Amino acid sequence: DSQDLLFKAESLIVNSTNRYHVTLQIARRAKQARYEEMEIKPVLRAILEMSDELN
Template identity: 50%
Template sequence: MTLRNPHLGIDNDELMRRVEALINASKNRYRITVQVANRAKRRRYDDPNDVEEGWMKPIRRAIIEMSDELTEPEIIGDE
């Protein structure tokens, strides 16, 4: 069963495909997991009063943003 929230514009299956793409593109599964978590945390604390983005959880937004940036190697590359 695929759940789709009209506000997100992305269903759970698509989100899982994006997560898999991030993990597969990274040499280190732990590092990409930490990078996604850090981006979500940073996003959450940057503007806690952001009403427009309140309907999307920070972790979902971080996954979507980072999967869109797969073409930039510094996002998922080893530092």
């Protein structure tokens, strides 16, 4: 849900110590995602993946 994405976003903004750096990482990840998927929306999948990787 939207709330879930908002919580995962907040979760990633913390523990990163740089909102800009983590926004850049999310952008890059989502770009690669869509690129290797054209072969859900990229930024969303990127955030889901990065949240699930933070354990």
